[PDB]
Amino acid sequence: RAPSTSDSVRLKCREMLAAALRTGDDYIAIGADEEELGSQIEEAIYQEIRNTDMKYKNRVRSRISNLKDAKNPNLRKNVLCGNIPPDLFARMTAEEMASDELKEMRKNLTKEAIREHQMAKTGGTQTDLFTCGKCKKKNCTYTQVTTFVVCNECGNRWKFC
Amino acid sequence: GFVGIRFCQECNNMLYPKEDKENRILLYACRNCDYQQEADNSCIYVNKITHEVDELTQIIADVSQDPTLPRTEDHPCQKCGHKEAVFFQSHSARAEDAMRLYYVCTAPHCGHRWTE
Amino acid sequence: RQLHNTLWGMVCPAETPEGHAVGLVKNLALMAYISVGSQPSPILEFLEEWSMENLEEISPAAIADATKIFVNGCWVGIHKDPEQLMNTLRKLRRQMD
Amino acid sequence: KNVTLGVPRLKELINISKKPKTPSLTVFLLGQSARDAERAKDILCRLEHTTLRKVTANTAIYYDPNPQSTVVAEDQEWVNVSPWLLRVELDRKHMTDRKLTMEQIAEKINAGFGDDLNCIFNDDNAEKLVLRIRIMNDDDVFLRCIESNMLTDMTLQGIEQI
Amino acid sequence: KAKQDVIEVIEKAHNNELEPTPGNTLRQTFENQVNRILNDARDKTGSSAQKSLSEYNNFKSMVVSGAKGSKINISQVIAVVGQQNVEGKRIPFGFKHRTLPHFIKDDYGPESRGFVENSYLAGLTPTEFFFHAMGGREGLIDTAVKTAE
Amino acid sequence: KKDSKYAYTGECRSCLENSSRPTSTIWVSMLARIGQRIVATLPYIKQEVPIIIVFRALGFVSDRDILEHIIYDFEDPEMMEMVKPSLDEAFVIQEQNVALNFIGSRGAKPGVTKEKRIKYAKEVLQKEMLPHVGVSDFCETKKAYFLGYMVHRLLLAALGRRELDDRDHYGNKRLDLAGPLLAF
Ligand SMILES: [Zn+2]
Ligand SMILES: [Zn+2]
């Protein structure tokens, strides 16, 4: 049970969180105490911040927006059903609270960006007919133009005329 | 949306914006004249960082009658449904990264353009 | 110094010095010919006769849907039918009149 | 990519210049990031200079008299609660690629210009990554100047030069 | 085969299927792929020409002895000259979006950008002859500036 | 040109016809960086002048007329935003006399008095810049149209809607044979 708070700001934040959780009526369907969940979330937020300063108000506003985001009521339902403990929701980040589709899209974009940041490997005809003298390995790639040799694993560089 | 210049009525000059502190509204004044007019667009300045410009708005129908422009039949027009058509790249500097074509129908009185 | 693409059939792409002046000295192609010069007045009159609004008296709003005619770099007059004007000009030059 | 070897590089090395032609570093990762690209992408992002211009898409200024009026249709101000504001909407693909969050962006934008503005960021669930920059306490051009100078250089995440 | 492959690459680029290779823009990756295809074709042709020589051939004798020449010289003489690059890139568009008046606009094809498909034994088409001239001129300019510096 | 403060430069070598005076050059450039402030380099003027002042000096008080000469269509606000900076820059020049005074003040031989500066400005604006269009008593209209055309081309180049002109394209070159060489 979240301890009661005599702070007007804390009470207002708890009421706002309870109202946000009541959006969608999922509280009735899950039989969850919306007021209790809101109080627990507010207590967790206060403990994390320890002050009802701009950081705490911003965190409360972000949490309320996440809960009332009708584009992903799955998170709200999970919170009302206990899937996300109030401490986890308080400590959860925007990426964590993102809906399933948004999370998948973000992951795909991040992977695409990571791939695009890379550098294209140097081309060549990989072969094991040449022995690298710097590592003793047989894997390497050759380029004809004088036949330049690039070690595969060791990376020995040499040319043959 | 964008914003287009609106000139004065008497002096015919550039009209700057002004926020009416009294009636709390948006007005356009003249530097020289004292002409005022109540604004309607409720926007002042917009910047397009991506510069998403539609090349079709720049293409013109006259390009069709060009003797040094390729022609194909596999992309018939839509409106007139003609067979012959021309195609070319953006032909515009600062092309970010694209060679997407812009087909233009080859027939008088049609001037149709499209992209695939 | 680099041999530009436009020098096709005007300047020999092979003949040139190989010292410090490589690429600067150039030779005309066998078929190359240089215009000696003429006068614009006959062309100005010929264009004036056609339905070519003169630049001095023309609604500015009418420049958009039109074509600007430059002669020797003088923006003079404006036409509303480039496709026919160019054809008439080409035929006239072909006949040499 | 470009290294400019040969006579130009020799000349640069001989003539110690304050600005070479192709300056560059070869940073070697140390931790586990040296193996998996996943934990090196973040390092690269944090070493690469990022600015509003790299994450922004459009920037429209509006003279919205009443904040709750919200001439534009966005249900983010009423929840959160000068007759003008800047709606600096951000790109998603770029922001994801650099892996930033509106929280840090807002903190940085507020701190850099002091407690003179109030950036009402937006939740990371809405499709549009809108923002709202307002000034509280010539004023028209002040927004233009501030937006110009911040867009030109803000250093959201990374160092300069790079 | 090389021509067909470059045509397919151009088709994919035109229809927006060629995804940008990492670290490069779409045009850059398109150019890189085309150059790799042409270089591979030239190498394959040169290898085929080399393997097709006879011990009594004199080019091969001089090259193997290393006195004067190289395998690339033989490949150009017999198999195919190859790409005629300038400033480390393919022939530019001197005219409006095209190399020479003969070719049509937006013709990135191999021969329309410099690819000398013939060989020095079978003569050269005029367009590729001009492009070869441009390559030689670039070489001479580089020689002069190097000697000066 | 990048090795300078101007992002673009609208060069134009004017020469009427083998005239006694040498060819005059008009550079209509734009500052790179407000931003996007257009300038000009008239002959015999050491400093630069904003284009709007020049247009007003040519006898165009109204702003709408200046824009019409410069921009041909008002339906593309994307282009208008590029000229608004330079337009608002010179907001303290409306009458023609003040414009002439401003132009003449930068002259190489600044008239000790106001009338001399005005006369010098008028002469330089009617005989030194763009001679080829016309140097008669009443040719200000065509000169203004040509200047607006140059500005329009510069704006088109800046927007990238039209690639820049190559410097080595022989289409932009002419050959001086024995004739012109001896005539000089
Ligand atoms: Zn007015
Ligand atoms: Zn059609």
Swiss-Prot record, chain A:
It comes from the Eukaryota. Keywords: Acetylation, Chromosomal rearrangement, DNA-binding, Isopeptide bond, Metal-binding, Nucleus, Phosphoprotein, Transcription, Transcription regulation, Ubl conjugation, Zinc, Zinc-finger. It is found in: Nucleus. GO terms for molecular function: DNA binding; zinc ion binding. One of its GO terms (cellular component) is transcription factor TFIID complex. GO terms for biological process: erythrocyte differentiation; positive regulation of transcription by RNA polymerase II; transcription by RNA polymerase II; transcription elongation by RNA polymerase II. The keyword NADP does not apply. Its main location: nucleus. The keyword Transcription applies. A zinc finger (TFIIS-type) spans 128-159. Disulfide bonds: none annotated. Zn(2+) binds at C132, C135, C151, C154. Coiled coil: none annotated. Residues 9-125 form the TFIIS central domain. Interacts with EAF2. Associates with UBR5 and forms a transcription regulatory complex made of CDK9, Pol II, UBR5 and TCEA1/TFIIS. Part of TBP-based Pol II pre-initiation complex (PIC), in which Pol II core assembles with general transcription factors and other specific initiation factors including GTF2E1, GTF2E2, GTF2F1, GTF2F2, TCEA1, ERCC2, ERCC3, GTF2H2, GTF2H3, GTF2H4, GTF2H5, GTF2A1, GTF2A2, GTF2B and TBP; this large multi-subunit PIC complex mediates DNA unwinding and targets Pol II core to the transcription start site where the first phosphodiester bond forms. S-II binds to RNA-polymerase II in the absence of transcription. Necessary for efficient RNA polymerase II transcription elongation past template-encoded arresting sites. The arresting sites in DNA have the property of trapping a certain fraction of elongating RNA polymerases that pass through, resulting in locked ternary complexes. Cleavage of the nascent transcript by S-II allows the resumption of elongation from the new 3'-terminus. It is linked to A chromosomal aberration involving TCEA1 may be a cause of salivary gland pleiomorphic adenomas (PA) [181030]. Pleiomorphic adenomas are the most common benign epithelial tumors of the salivary gland. Translocation t(3;8)(p21;q12) with PLAG1. Belongs to the TFS-II family. This is Transcription elongation factor A protein 1. It comes from Homo sapiens. The lineage of its organism: Eukaryota, Metazoa, Chordata, Craniata, Vertebrata. The chain holds residues 132 to 301 of 301 of the full protein.
UniProtKB/Swiss-Prot annotation, chain B:
This is DNA-directed RNA polymerase II subunit RPB9. Keywords: Acetylation, DNA-directed RNA polymerase, Metal-binding, Nucleus, Transcription, Zinc, Zinc-finger. Its main location: nucleus. It is found in: Nucleus, Nucleolus. Belongs to the archaeal RpoM/eukaryotic RPA12/RPB9/RPC11 RNA polymerase family. A zinc finger (TFIIS-type) spans 73-115. DNA-dependent RNA polymerase catalyzes the transcription of DNA into RNA using the four ribonucleoside triphosphates as substrates. Component of RNA polymerase II which synthesizes mRNA precursors and many functional non-coding RNAs. Pol II is the central component of the basal RNA polymerase II transcription machinery. It is composed of mobile elements that move relative to each other. RPB9 is part of the upper jaw surrounding the central large cleft and thought to grab the incoming DNA template. Zn(2+) 1 binds at C8, C11, C30, C33. Component of the RNA polymerase II (Pol II) complex consisting of 12 subunits. The keyword Zinc applies. Gene3D superfamilies: 2.20.25.10. The gene is POLR2I. One of its GO terms (biological process) is transcription-coupled nucleotide-excision repair. GO terms for molecular function: DNA-directed RNA polymerase activity; nucleic acid binding; zinc ion binding. A zinc finger (C4-type) spans 8-33. It comes from Sus scrofa (Pig). GO terms for cellular component: nucleolus; nucleus; RNA polymerase II, core complex. Zn(2+) 2 binds at C77, C80, C105, C110.
